[PDB]
């Protein structure tokens, strides 16, 4: 099955930009159908970004213009966050869904900790 590669932690500068890497080697016969990034709120992950057939969707206005997800190379769905705030410190989850040629779906996810440094 696919494996998402995401570092354990990432540190970005206060009021600056950072990239949260999330990559995988695409497998033959696997079609990517959903990409989500989620921020962890206690026990509950909360979607901040969703990519599907219809395009990209940012889920909260506080991210509008600050949030971008790579789309150029298959297998790279890293998340770029600009103008980092102290409140952006959190665990983030990269979550990718694929469909196999028999219609079944496979989901993988992985967690990184975002640190923000003054």
């Amino acid at each position, epitope marked *: 099955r696919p494996i998402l590669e995401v570092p*354990e932690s990432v540190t970005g500068p206060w009021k600056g930009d950072v990239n949260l890497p999330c990559t995988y080697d695409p497998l033959q016969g696997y079609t990517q159908v959903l990409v989500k990034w989620l921020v962890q709120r*206690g026990s509950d992950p909360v979607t901040i970004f969703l990519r599907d057939s219809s395009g990209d969707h940012i889920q909260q206005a506080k991210y509008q213009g600050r949030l971008h997800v790579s789309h150029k190379v298959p297998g790279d769905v890293s998340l770029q966050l600009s103008t980092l705030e102290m409140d952006d410190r959190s*665990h983030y989850t990269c979550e990718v869904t694929w469909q196999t040629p028999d219609g079944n779906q496979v989901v*993988r996810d992985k*967690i990184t900790e975002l640190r923000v440094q003054k």
Partner: nanobody, 125 residues
Framework: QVQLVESGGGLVQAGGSLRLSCAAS????????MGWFRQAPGKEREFVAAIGPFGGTTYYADSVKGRFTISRDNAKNTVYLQMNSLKPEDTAVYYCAAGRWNRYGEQDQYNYEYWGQGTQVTVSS
């Protein structure tokens, strides 16, 4: 860098019980999914059970559901596997493992970043 240490294995009579534990070193134990795998002589390693990060959702292989219980004590950086109604088919080396999956892929061995050294469990008749 993470170090995983299993404790609690050994010899047990069929129908009896054992508790395995795995102590992890590090600062952010609660943000790792923790899993148990086992390998019997002459077979491939297989999933037994897992407990996810944060809230701690539990996952069980069908062959152990109802008989095994997994839990974690985040104050102790420890995960526990309570093994009840043990059968001779449960004889194997049991491995503790730690990964940064969240809600998916918990049975996939490649989804774990750190592997303990494993402890023998033997169920006799």
């Amino acid at each position: 860098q993470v170090q995983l240490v299993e404790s609690g294995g050994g010899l047990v009579q069929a129908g009896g019980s054992l508790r395995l534990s795995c102590a992890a070193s590090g600062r952010t134990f609660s943000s790792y999914g923790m899993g148990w795998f086992r390998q019997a002589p002459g077979k491939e390693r297989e999933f037994v059970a897992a407990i996810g990060p944060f809230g701690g959702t539990t996952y069980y292989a069908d062959s152990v559901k109802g008989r095994f219980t997994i839990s974690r004590d985040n104050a102790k950086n420890t995960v526990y596997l309570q093994m009840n109604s043990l059968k001779p088919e449960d004889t194997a080396v049991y491995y503790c493992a730690a990964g940064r999956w969240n809600r998916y892929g918990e049975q996939d061995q490649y989804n774990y970043e750190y592997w303990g050294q494993g402890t023998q469990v033997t169920v006799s008749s």
